[PDB]
Amino acid sequence: FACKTANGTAIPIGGGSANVYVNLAPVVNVGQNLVVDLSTQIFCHNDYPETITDYVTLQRGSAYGGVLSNFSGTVKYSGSSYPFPTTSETPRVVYNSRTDKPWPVALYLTPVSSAGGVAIKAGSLIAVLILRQTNNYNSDDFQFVWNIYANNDVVVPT
Ligand SMILES: OC[C@H]1O[C@H](C/C=C/c2ccc3ncccc3c2)[C@@H](O)[C@@H](O)[C@@H]1O
Numbered sequence: 001f002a003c004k005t006a007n008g009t010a011i012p013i014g015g016g017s018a019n020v021y022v023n024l025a026p027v028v029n030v031g032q033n034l035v036v037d038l039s040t041q042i043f044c045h046n047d048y049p050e051t052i053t054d055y056v057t058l059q060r061g062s063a064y065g066g067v068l069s070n071f072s073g074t075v076k077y078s079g080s081s082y083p084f085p086t087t088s089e090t091p092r093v094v095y096n097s098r099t100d101k102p103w104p105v106a107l108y109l110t111p112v113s114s115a116g117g118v119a120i121k122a123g124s125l126i127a128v129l130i131l132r133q134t135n136n137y138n139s140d141d142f143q144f145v146w147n148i149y150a151n152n153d154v155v156v157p158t
Contacts, residue, residue, distance in 0.1 A: 001054045001095065001133050003044040003103065003144055013047065015133065015142030021149045024120060028111060028156055034071065036107040038129070042146060043100035052137045054095040058105060059132035059143070061086040066120035066154065067127060073109035081108075089132070103131060111156045120154035 004010040009018045020041060028034045046054045058077045062085045067073070075084040078093050084107060095101055107127065111119060120126060131144035 001044065001046055001056075001135070001142070003042060003131070004100070005043070006041050011144045013142075014140075015144045017145040017147065019147045019149055021151045023151045024154045026152060026155060028119075028154060030111050030113060030115065030156065030158060032110065034073075034107075034109040034111075034154065036109065036127070036148065038105045038107075038146070038148070039102040042103040042105070042131075044095055044103055044131075045098050045100050046095045047098070049096045049098060052135050055092040055134045055136070056095055056103070057092050057132045058082075058086065058090045059130040060089075061127060061129045063127055065124040065126050066118075066150070067107075067109055070112055070115035070119040070156065071109040072112055073107055076104075076106045076108060078104045084109075084127075092134075105129060115156040116158055117155060118153050119156045120150050122150055122152045124150050126150055 073084045074081045077090045127148040129146045133142045
């Protein structure tokens with residue numbers, strides 16, 4: 001079981017860390033949502049599906065930088081909503097193909113009422129998401145750490 005981004009950045013068997021750069025929407029007004037859709041960007045396969053089934057959760061997600069300072073939000077995992085920052089581990093997604101499948105994670109962020117001007121600086125860390133991978137085979141308990149970076153600024157006008 002290994003993951004790669006669209007960019008090419010990989011985390012191999014046994015897990016690891018990666019830096020992921022997302023284009024964000026340049027402008028977001030108060031009570032509009034900012035979406036960080038990582039299901040278009042992070043992908044994962046099972047390396048031996050014939051006899052092994054991989055089980056993947058969002059263990060932990062935390063907010064940094066502009067998102068920590070001037071956005072409240074939720075995370076969507078596999079079609080359900082959870083608080084962000086995350087208060088618990090989610091239900092598991094099954095991976096049983098050698099073909100890449102999205103990691104089904106998106107953030108729904110909305111500016112707090114304080115927020116104005118540049119509220120996310122380009123190049124800044126905005127989140128760290130921990131994919132936890134297990135299987136029906138042995139004790140493997142691997143962390144795939146995704147460190148999410150803004151490619152661009154985000155302005156909250158008013
Ligand atoms: O995705 C399945 C597994 O992939 C690797 C270990 C791989 C096992 C294996 C075992 C016997 C094999 N026999 C013939 C050819 C290949 C073989 C591969 C880890 O990421 C693990 O955490 C994950 O569950």
